[PDB]
Paper text:
[name] (TV) has emerged as a crucial surrogate for HuNoVs due to its close resemblance in amino acid composition and the availability of a robust cell culture system. The structure of TV reveals the characteristic T = 3 icosahedral lattice comprising 90 dimers of the [name] [name]. [name] subunits further divide into two domains: the shell domain (S domain), constituting the inner spherical shell of the virus capsid, and the protruding domain (P domain), further divided into the P1 and P2 sub-domains. In this study, we introduce, through cryo-electron microscopy (cryo-EM), the structure of a specific TV variant (the 9-6-17 TV) that has notably lost its ability to bind to its receptor, B-type HBGA—a finding confirmed using an enzyme-linked immunosorbent assay (ELISA).
To reduce this disulfide bond, we treated one sample with [name] and the other one without [name] to serve as the control sample. These two datasets used the same batch of viruses and were collected in the same session. The OptiPrep was largely dialyzed away for this sample. The identity of this extra density is unknown. Notably, four of these mutations are situated on the top surface of the P2 domain, which serves as the interaction surface with host cell receptors. An elongated extra density was found at the interface of the two subunits in both the A/B dimers and the C/C dimers near residues P425, V341 and M352. The pocket around it is mostly composed of hydrophobic residues (F329, V341, I380, M382, P425) with only one charged residue, D342, and one polar residue, T432.
Numbering used by the authors:
A (entry chain C), B (entry chain C): 1 to 527
C (entry chain B): 20 to 527
D (entry chain C): 1 to 134
The structure:
């Protein structure tokens, strides 16, 4: 609206158009209540930089009414104002947003962008989006559109934590083309408007998310496996069958740290004790009941977890009488320690009854005919024995009550989880030792070591991290998405249950993307 | 020299003097070669902030000729220019440094400050310091002295990595007073001079040390013990006897990460294997020789470590035939794993010969009369047995060769180490199991979890970190110094070998201090 | 877009002499050495297509002159030549990186630097000026310099059938450019032009099988990687791994008999190679004598395949009754002592006298071995410097020097009956000889023309500084062979991402 | 360089460009040593004629670096000056050469032309050809 410029393409088979528009007038604050007004380096106003989570692709499949992009107008748009904002208490002013469109004269379709005031819901149809102040582009001639996005507020200047307006981009008319694999690419860049200002210098220690996250180059094999300490991580894994995870040990979150029953020192908390309560259950051998000790939950209330912190979540099976069991060290407690430590078979709760068969509680099986009454015993989970395989260990027992356990999660459609494997050694016995375990592999959703760095540099709100995985000195690079909930996903096309990736390491940070972002790189599982 | 101001104290029993001096004229660069000149927020020039490592105390014991303070003139002096410098490639300009002296009219003594040009050694006598451009203060009347410190250079503007001038402060005449516990306190504050400028905005990801270090509030008991995984850290420890450390597992450094034989995943690397080579040594039972496997050092060259990564460094003793030994799990390797895993006694190298008695090599003892020839075996260090106590485990075996092992370290005179303890459970046996371990405690210099955050935010060059340790909700606070070499020290006055500190946690960052800084808080070991 | 970063003119007031340039080199544009690259629909976003230091090497006239001077000062004016089309649309990014700053990893961090966006349909004839960010009043050779980086911003897409787009850069010194100090013209700059004396491949020696002339050049689909140790040469380092500049001279070796044996239908006796250059057998030096065989015979099948060799007992001033025996590396049934490049071997000799020197001439392989087994080399372990394994960029295949090895038969039970096989070497020392004179431009690859029938047929290969040649092939097959008439010719320097326009059809 | 002219194709789906360039300045001889200076029929200067051996075809197979055309600047370029030269002993002056290209707006590629001074070898790569005036 403010101005328009047209240029002829090379060869004179079309044109490109550059426009500047101000759909909503800007009201400039007088800043009369600001104790001090702090100016910016003048060169910051002249430097367009890419906006985090400001990229998307339009294909013939994309339908109108789906929100492709939604961003708040704040200092986080620009790379340098984001870094500067850590030294200040408040801010005021708008931004100039530039849409870059890679169009062509032999395509068809339209695009719409609009400004949403604060405290207004975003609609899900291009028809309603025309109610807002907006602008429309055509793929045949669009080259770059500059939007003078205003800073809508009812106060003199902003403190941290307010509600802010948004920019929304949507397809107005579907894309068409003779070629079946043509697609339009959209990118956003921003810079503060000349009237942008800061106020009230303060020491630079804030809770914001750093615009750039620095990841130490520690490789995966140098990281611990939460669900199987004492065994190093050997490779990364992708399985098509594993469409969900219900584990409670390898769960970490950006906001509230550990989740469910997880801990930051898996090796330290791997040990527990039981009291060997009376009672027994039937079987060809004789099985015994024991109640786990809860030092952190001395009074067995339903609010706190019912099992020792970070204890164990193998998962034996829905029903396995003489087929599958868990094997652990066990020894009677005496002064100064324990005596006669040897391998025994065990499991969770009773067998026949439901709700106690495979669940978290204090009740556990013991394969000890000579289990002394009301005496304390040691428990080192070790591994599994019988007919157990990888699948049985993968599925953890269910959780019940009101002790805010870790919720089950699934990947977005079209993506698959990435795991940390570990070879669990097999234990064999020739004499009458009692038990014989079998080889098996254990997977963990996430390791605390990787998430440790992320805590120092939090994630920007409503964004995920796109990471590069360098293996052969840069020749081979893989792309993963790291969600705040604490899992990694990859884009796949094939179907395989045994895909292996080396553990050379060197994780690298690429950029911030939306949760619905589609990874450009694709991992072919059929190979 | 430029100006002086005198004021009368309350009660008219003395005066205080404020002076501004420019001992060395400033040459202002024209910045003709700078592609862009970036200005600063004008309010940054008016904000004096404390200089990191800019505090010291003068007592009657302090003698002239000892360097109390030495700082480079760079953007790191000011809190805000340090944060701003991460966005830029170069800088140019001087600083104004203010000395604040807490003097009194009924004391005596003098103080001297000087400016050292680049590439000049700092002398160790006040007599030679008068050769430089300098200024002299008197404790009877000194209140605040402002120094216009110039930016001495022979280039148009600075890049990272140059040599810079320094400010040095020294006692000119010793302090005297009727009271025996009087002492003067000195502090430095700084702000850039009006001609300071930056140049060439670049994305803010640099290798500098952040002016403020943010420490996660994870308590010690949530951290792993490098020298004893599977046992949680239970308390912090101070011992007067332990005047040095020669360990090789709990060694981490700010610059080159792990040191000696340490690893970032102690639990994962705690396991090793041996080959059970031929030969034997005398004894009432029969002992056997075995050679440790080195997957990381397949060819046993003297350049690389001679033992498995992060394996074990207990330390049994200088000579213990039938008194002290190490006890571990052991089992013969078979397809899929190991069989007949049970506790056995072992040690390092042979017994009589020197250089192999207590040293790192592949040779180790095995307490297995039926040790099969040239067969692989598992080794889980577990613990100790016999007459071993805390002292024996504390002293690790020596290291020889040219495999850049971890050097031995000692605390500065008047300070003591702070350790991480862990109760090692005792293993008892009633039947003919073979061995019986004893309770013992294990100490580690540092845990990787604490150092993990420090890697993200490096230390400023030539500085140590002063940390606050909050225990009872802020009521009780302890002060420790964290050195880049990777150990913590505390100021003590008493003499005790069993001082215990809880593990409530909540480490906090206070400020940057010099290595010779003396902690104000004192821990009384006699209580 | 014309000038991402301002260019600050230096007065050169500290230079002892200010040496002016010919006024006419300022006026006309020339192609930038190594400034050519191509964009394809398969190119991934965020991948660096071109990286150049702002230096006198951006122009071939100033590059030639710079061999004669010790200092310089000033920037350059670049012009962009795009061979686009009407159907394809994409977008590029060009940025200036100040000296002492690391190059970013992703396109979104690159936008932090001074930059500007190119659109394929309007990019042609765009002009960019590259300033030089300097510390001193002028540069000394060996300083750290700013650099220009070009990266894919939006991937190339086409409405119609896809076309590749080829990009060229031309440059000329900016009017303030000047030299200084006038030193003799033997400085260390890489010459903008490389002159290759004419030498047909069959006139070159085959390092991995001397005594057999190179018969023809070879391209195979299956051979995806090379792990050889003999035919490895590098312009920066010279001979790599266990290579030598005199393959025939180092072919012969000797070994000393060892105690023991192993199991076999006949008897398998031990031997131990001599190491004149490694007397103490320390871990940091090669385990085997320089230039010795690196053929592989099966991963573990010590009995199915066998290497063969002439062997004779040591005698004063010579050797006696040399005859053909079998041999192989390592003791077999072991990870580190089987099919491994190390000094322990065994010989098929019924009676091998202990602690006696013996000849070892690798000759040829026998048994069930075929050329596929021969090419795979024994693995290397230890701390000594061994040649890294290499693979060509996706879409390209190696070009090998091929030699044919005659077989050997016998009526009498002399011990063996060798099998005819073919030998391949990735590089030959003779071709590298010339390159050492003229260095390669930093991080650039030589594009060579191989013309055969008096100009009628021309093949295009890329020679990498690591020491291998590759060809772009639409098809991939095992049996394709190029004649050996020869006459290599130098074409230009290209970026390693460049894709050869000329294509070789292998399936047909 | 001297001038450029642009025209729209029929249907307005592209353009055609006609240019006049003088990459190397001409030095005009004073002819002070010539016993006689003989002029030409003025109509000969206005008659473009095809140059012998001045035709070639570019296909997708043709590769850069191959010399498609190489001609000496002499009276043999023009049909009438070639016939006239038989009556004379000497000559002096340059020529105007016109390249006619049958292009189309829906193709791609580029072409380069250069002037080689006497006693200089012709290179076999477009990269080196940019060294000459072109």
């Amino acid at each position: 609206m403010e101005s328009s410029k047209t240029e002829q393409v090379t060869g004179a088979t079309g044109i490109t158009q550059s426009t500047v528009t101000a759909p909503l007038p800007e009201a400039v604050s007088s800043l009369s209540l600001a104790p001090t007004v702090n100016a910016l380096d003048p060169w910051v106003y002249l430097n367009q930089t890419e906006v985090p989570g400001g990229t998307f692709t339009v294909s013939s499949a994309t339908q109108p009414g789906s929100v492709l992009l939604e961003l708040e107008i704040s200092p986080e748009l620009n790379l340098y104002t984001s870094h500067l904002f850590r030294m200040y208490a408040g801010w005021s002013g708008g931004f100039s947003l530039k849409l870059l469109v890679a169009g062509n004269a032999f395509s068809a379709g339209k695009l719409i962008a609009a400004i949403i005031p604060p405290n207004i819901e975003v609609p899900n149809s291009a028809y309603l989006l025309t109610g807002f102040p907006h602008e429309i582009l055509d793929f045949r001639t669009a080259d770059s559109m500059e939007i003078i996005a205003p800073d809508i507020k009812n106060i003199d200047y902003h403190f941290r934590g307010d509600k802010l307006g948004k920019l929304v981009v949507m397809v107005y008319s579907p894309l068409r083309s003779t070629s079946a694999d043509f697609e339009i690419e959209i990118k956003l860049t921003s810079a503060p408007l000349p009237d942008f200002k800061f106020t009230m210098l303060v020491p630079p220690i804030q809770n914001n998310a750093l615009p750039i996250w620095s990841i130490p180059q520690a490789p995966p094999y140098s990281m611990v496996n939460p669900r199987s300490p004492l065994t190093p991580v050997v490779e990364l894994y992708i399985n098509s069958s594993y469409a969900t995870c219900n584990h409670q040990l390898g769960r970490y979150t950006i906001y509230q740290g550990a989740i469910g029953n997880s801990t930051f020192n898996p090796s330290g908390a791997w040990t527990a004790t039981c009291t060997a309560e009376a009672g027994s259950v039937t079987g060809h051998p004789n099985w015994r009941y024991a109640l786990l000790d809860l030092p952190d939950n001395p009074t067995f209330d339903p609010t706190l977890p019912p099992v020792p912190r970070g204890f164990c979540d193998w998962g034996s099976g829905v029903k396995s009488g003489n087929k599958q069991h868990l094997v652990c060290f066990t020894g009677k407690k005496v002064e100064g320690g324990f005596q006669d430590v040897d391998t025994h078979m065990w499991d969770y709760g009773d067998n026949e009854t439901v709700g106690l068969d495979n669940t978290y509680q204090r009740t556990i099986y013991i394969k000890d005919p000579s289990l002394e009454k009301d005496a304390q015993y040691l428990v080192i989970p070790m591994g599994v024995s019988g007919a157990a395989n990888d699948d049985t260990v993968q599925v953890a027992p269910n959780c019940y009550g009101s002790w805010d356990y870790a919720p089950t999660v699934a990947p977005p459609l079209g993506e698959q989880f990435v795991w940390f494997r570990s070879q669990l050694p097999a234990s064999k016995t020739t004499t009458t030792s009692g038990v014989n375990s079998v080889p098996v592999n254990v997977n963990a959703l996430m390791s605390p070591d990787l998430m440790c760095s992320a805590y120092a540099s939090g994630f920007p709100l409503g964004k995920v991290a796109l990471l590069d995985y360098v293996l052969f000195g840069g020749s081979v690079v893989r792309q993963f998405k790291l969600y705040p909930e604490g899992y990694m996903t990859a884009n796949t096309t094939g179907s395989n249950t045994g895909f292996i990736i080396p553990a050379d390491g060197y994780f690298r940070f690429n950029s911030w993307v939306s949760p619905s972002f589609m990874i450009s790189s694709v991992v072919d599982l059929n190979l």
